Amino acid sequence: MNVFNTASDEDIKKGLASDVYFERTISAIGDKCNDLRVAMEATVSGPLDTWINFTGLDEVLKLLEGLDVDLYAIPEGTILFPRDANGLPVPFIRVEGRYCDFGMYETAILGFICQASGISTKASKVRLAAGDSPFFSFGIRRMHPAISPMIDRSAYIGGADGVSGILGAKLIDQDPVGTMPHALSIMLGDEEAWKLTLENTKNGQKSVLLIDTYMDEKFAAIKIAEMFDKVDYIRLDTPSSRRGNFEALIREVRWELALRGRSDIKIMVSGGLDENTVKKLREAGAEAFGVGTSISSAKPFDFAMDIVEVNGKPETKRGKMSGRKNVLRCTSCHRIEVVPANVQEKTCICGGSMQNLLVKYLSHGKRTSEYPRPKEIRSRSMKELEYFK
Amino acid sequence: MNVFNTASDEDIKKGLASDVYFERTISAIGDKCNDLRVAMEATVSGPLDTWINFTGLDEVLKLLEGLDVDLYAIPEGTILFPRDANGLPVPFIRVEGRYCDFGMYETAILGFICQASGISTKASKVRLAAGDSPFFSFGIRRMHPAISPMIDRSAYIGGADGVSGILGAKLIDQDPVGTMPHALSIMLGDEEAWKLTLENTKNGQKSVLLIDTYMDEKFAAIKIAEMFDKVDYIRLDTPSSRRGNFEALIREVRWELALRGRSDIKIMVSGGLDENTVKKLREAGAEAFGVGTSISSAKPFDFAMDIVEVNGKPETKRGKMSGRKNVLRCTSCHRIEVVPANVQEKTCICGGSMQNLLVKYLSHGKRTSEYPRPKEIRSRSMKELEYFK
Amino acid sequence: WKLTLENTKNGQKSVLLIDTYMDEKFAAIKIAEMFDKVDYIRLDTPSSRRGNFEALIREVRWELALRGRSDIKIMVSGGLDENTVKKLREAGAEAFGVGT
Amino acid sequence: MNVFNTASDEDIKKGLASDVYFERTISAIGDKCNDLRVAMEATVSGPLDTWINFTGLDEVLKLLEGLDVDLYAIPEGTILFPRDANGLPVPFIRVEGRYCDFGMYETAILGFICQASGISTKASKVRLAAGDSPFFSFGIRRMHPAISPMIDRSAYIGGADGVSGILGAKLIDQDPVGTMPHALSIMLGDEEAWKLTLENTKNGQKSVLLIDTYMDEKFAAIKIAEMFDKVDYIRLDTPSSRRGNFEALIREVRWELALRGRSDIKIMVSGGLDENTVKKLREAGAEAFGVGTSISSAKPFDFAMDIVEVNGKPETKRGKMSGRKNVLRCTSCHRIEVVPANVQEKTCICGGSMQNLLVKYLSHGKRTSEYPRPKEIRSRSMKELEYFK
Ligand SMILES: O=C(O)c1ccc[n+]([C@@H]2O[C@H](COP(=O)([O-])O)[C@@H](O)[C@H]2O)c1
Ligand SMILES: O=C(O)c1ccc[n+]([C@@H]2O[C@H](COP(=O)([O-])O)[C@@H](O)[C@H]2O)c1
Ligand SMILES: O=C(O)c1ccc[n+]([C@@H]2O[C@H](COP(=O)([O-])O)[C@@H](O)[C@H]2O)c1
Ligand SMILES: O=C(O)c1ccc[n+]([C@@H]2O[C@H](COP(=O)([O-])O)[C@@H](O)[C@H]2O)c1
């Protein structure tokens, strides 16, 4: 339909971004369509050995808005495990209405939550490792450009303090983050590149200088210390083959700077960073992190959507549990317990009462509240990430 | 800019889908821009323990067409390793021109080849395992819908005989593939669902019936054998928790059918399939495969783009090899050898002569040939996949 | 099933083997809404159908409670071990037939 | 019923050695009994990563003789894998008749083949490792005495040249094997014990002297060499805690004997022997082996018996393949292929023709041939063990 190999928002809204057997089956159903009301629930088949930071539901609402459907879901930014206290699959969203009215959208709805959720969950992990130190989403270049804005949104909501993509920055309503590339230094030499970068950085923003382009990080650090003065960060993006012991290198640089009484210069690292990498380099002395691929490429959660009830009667296939359900959670020990939809709360001297986490976002196609902006959502997940060490 | 969290083709064409430090650095360069001609080469830092089936270059050409740049690259569908006979990084594409003229596109260019390449490479692996048996791309639902068309294109070029997505089908100029979903059987019961599916399938296409919704695959298979007649395939999408030994189950079904002299009914499997899974189930008796997540979620190759020459002089950073280069390959023992761009061919009694694999696709922004359609490209990769067992 | 029930007397609990033809889940529903005095339901799931015996057992227990028949207890058997027993018990199995 | 916790032959013949639910179910069936003819086949669920040397069928015939049943089976001593060329379970015996007529015997029939088969299969393994060297079944003391005769029978049929048990010896029609115990040496001292043993050994039999009771095997070996003359074997049953390197010790002894030109004295080992142990000690110089626990305690094969057809119609449960079946094998490349009972032979240019391995041993309760004696059976398994390295 368009220039690149992508689906326009129109196309996806028309049911064009889907597996053909859906429209073909709806077509086969024909007249019976009018008489088939169902409730479908999305659950995680995917990785069960990890909690998840739910994200991407905003996209689902924009898609289903208008159809005569009811939509329940766990708010984005909520963190929990895929199975509850008793090993039951936790339903993340429930859709109700005439099957033929939205059935062709299964592909898109899953797509909206699988990939986004893996991203935000990976970012929350990095968030835990980075501690008080700032980290940024630097990985849109590893994924197809068309989805670069949602990648940065999920990395942000997941915990990133900032983002490098222009469009994602816009979406989360923050200024894009950026330092200087090796290119500048390869074209103009270090000195010229460093001077230019400093002359071009204004208040409100910190100075960052890339130093591993030509020299050894240690001598490049000395040269900068005794050449400039207003340099906030020094960034090391050490080539893989020079990374014998990145931690030892970072200690060496910090020592060499303090010796010259320039321990005011902070260190930022980037390049093939991970939560493990981040934790180690931080204990080594790195105070800022540029994290890309590990986050932008997070494996998606394997969400599945199934009809759990038909025309009021619980009905499913082998492997699924039938009936509409709610997701209750203790107001205290954040314990979960999936229950039949006719149960709204449950007591538990363990920690007060258990209240439903599901929330109605659409009623007959209409929104039931104003949707939170990214900042509000990541403010929620940071509070929720609290209960996870 | 648009409804969903995506970048429109306009946005990406405007340099909007990128890391801000690129435009910011180009901006800083200012007047010097006119005097900075560079050649940048994309190489695989990514997985080195595997060959790659290069895909996504078509998207790169549509992006760079118009800029006053020269573009060299390895044609899509070429299969090779990231390092050559002597462990040197193989350059997959080279761009030449004023740095400020395209420098902001680094993010998009990488995005176009990293993710697509992982997909097509994973599909070639499945292609090797499926043997003569047909397999289809069934995984767009795991990834964001906006990029569903490129996913199916790469799975196709990589070896898939067919694809389930509507838009991807259109792009590769083939009819979308589809069978029947559990939903149909959950709403109308098996019998009704099976009868409907058969009545709704026309010549040119084979009949496929999903059987694991309510019954045990074995008894559902008997019931179908002695109930219908014109049923080409039987599809098993056995729930994970019922998959004690999927291979043994498949043998059991095949035996039970032959006993009733209905070995004409073929078996198709789907659900969490892998190349290993595919190889085993095929040795077990499965004759068709629906492969999703393992392919749609393939890890991306970690491509990196660097300035390798400036205003005619070889120049790079630590970790990269400078100078423009060519990629020569033996016409026989498909051996590779990266060399300086002033070397077009090399002899080698090992197998004739070594000829350059790089091909000029853009000259001063103009195409230098008509771009191949998906069918032509996968016809190339199947020939190339020949030299790989 | 009818024969087994008619043939079981007081002092002893009723036990019905359910995995012979149907999927344990649907066989469990069918029994719940067909009988009433069935103490135990026994699953001797064939090895090749045992993808995740624990998950299957949870599925059955849920499907029964939904129909308010959580009074029906579950017994497992077939290639059981102390490890197997500990896991299936945490899964919801209340009786075990342990052989080999 | 008797002194010890055993089932008399009467008890087992009466259906007393069984799981109660069998008679209880037959009882429940009542009048329908007259109308329920079935065919049940025994298959190996058990270890599938190994071939099996089938044994114990003789016991099954003595149990079923008289009942109006037909019995097919693979002859004892046949060696093969549990699954055929295509991964299908191989049926080892088939019983046909009124279910109520023998159904209570399932427990006993399985018991007769599971444990015996593990024993004979383990012995064939030791047989392969022992090579040309003789080994004996020495393990009845680890198992309940009541079944000591069947243990030695299976170890013999499996490959043992001799057996230590009195009753088992009788059953295989051979003289029991025996050397001298530590007791004799603990009560009378070595010299007296050795002299007594020699004075008490007659022609036809070799002399064997236990030497590790008091001295170091090396010095005890010297002492014997220069004290006696007609000593055929020297037996080392070195205590576990003295077995630092049993192989090195054995080499040391052999050297010390040859030095004194007494390499005519052969060495026999015993104590915690295995096929691996046997292979190593044999390469070390041991020429005879006393093998116990590893054989007498062999894990049983997990045989299962199921109704595969009812009143002429193929019928089974999930997990089993229905219908009566035959087991065909190539007269050459000893390949197997289970097929429907209406197939007696199959061609295969691979190696002549495939002929049925199943053999009718009972017809209406009557034997259809004279049953082979143990010697004939192990003569068969040694020929069959040929095709296994
Ligand atoms: O400097 C920036 O603002 C910047 C923004 C986005 C990505 N990057 C670069 O891309 C690399 C990190 O991506 P990755 O996948 O190796 O983690 C690292 O070498 C950075 O120099 C750099
Ligand atoms: O039937 C189709 O045409 C079809 C097209 C695309 C995806 N699917 C389904 O999605 C599942 C396979 O995706 P996956 O990631 O588990 O490999 C499998 O259970 C199929 O039933 C099915
Ligand atoms: O139901 C009984 O009373 C019964 C008594 C003894 C043994 N069994 C069966 O034998 C199997 C268990 O033995 P095992 O070695 O697999 O643990 C299991 O499938 C049961 O159905 C069953
Ligand atoms: O000497 C015999 O005739 C003899 C007959 C049967 C068993 N044994 C002994 O029992 C031991 C071997 O049994 P095992 O289970 O350790 O292999 C070994 O120490 C022998 O001395 C010895």
Side-chain angles (χ1 to χ4, degrees), chain A residues 120-176:
Chain A
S120 51
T121 299
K122 198 54 158 54
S124 286
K125 303 282 187 47
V126 173
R127 175 72 272 156
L128 294 173
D132 37 57
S133 297
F135 80 94
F136 313 96
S137 192
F138 270 14
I140 52 176
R141 72 184 50 191
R142 219 58 71 195
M143 298 311 265
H144 188 100
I147 59 175
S148 67
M150 92 87 156
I151 291 176
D152 283 324
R153 177 178 182 276
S154 289
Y156 179 63
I157 293 179
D161 305 285
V163 145
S164 77
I166 286 161
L167 305 180
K170 189 174 178 294
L171 191 58
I172 58 161
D173 186 53
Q174 292 281 176
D175 279 300

Side-chain angles (χ1 to χ4, degrees), chain A residues 111-240:
Chain A
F112 285 142
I113 59 176
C114 290
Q115 182 169 28
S117 288
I119 298 167
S120 51
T121 299
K122 198 54 158 54
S124 286
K125 303 282 187 47
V126 173
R127 175 72 272 156
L128 294 173
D132 37 57
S133 297
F135 80 94
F136 313 96
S137 192
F138 270 14
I140 52 176
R141 72 184 50 191
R142 219 58 71 195
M143 298 311 265
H144 188 100
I147 59 175
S148 67
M150 92 87 156
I151 291 176
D152 283 324
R153 177 178 182 276
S154 289
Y156 179 63
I157 293 179
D161 305 285
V163 145
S164 77
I166 286 161
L167 305 180
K170 189 174 178 294
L171 191 58
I172 58 161
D173 186 53
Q174 292 281 176
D175 279 300
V177 177
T179 63
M180 53 157 282
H182 294 281
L184 178 56
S185 195
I186 294 172
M187 292 188 270
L188 320 178
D190 284 319
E191 280 181 51
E192 183 60 354
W194 293 331
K195 300 177 183 179
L196 194 73
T197 308
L198 292 175
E199 299 187 298
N200 282 292
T201 140
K202 227 298 176 183
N203 288 301
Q205 64 181 176
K206 251 76 162 55
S207 319
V208 180
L209 269 51
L210 226 205
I211 76 182
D212 59 277
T213 307
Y214 293 102
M215 306 181 251
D216 173 85
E217 291 70 8
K218 182 260 210 64
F219 293 111
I222 303 289
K223 193 167 194 286
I224 284 186
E226 54 187 49
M227 184 181 270
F228 304 95
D229 11 55
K230 176 65 168 63
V231 43
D232 297 291
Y233 288 92
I234 272 301
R235 195 188 93 182
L236 292 60
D237 194 57
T238 308
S240 166

Side-chain angles (χ1 to χ4, degrees), chain A residues 306-318:
Chain A
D306 295 279
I307 287 179
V308 78
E309 176 182 290
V310 175
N311 295 321
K313 311 174 186 65
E315 261 297 290
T316 46
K317 29 103 72 179
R318 305 153 61 222

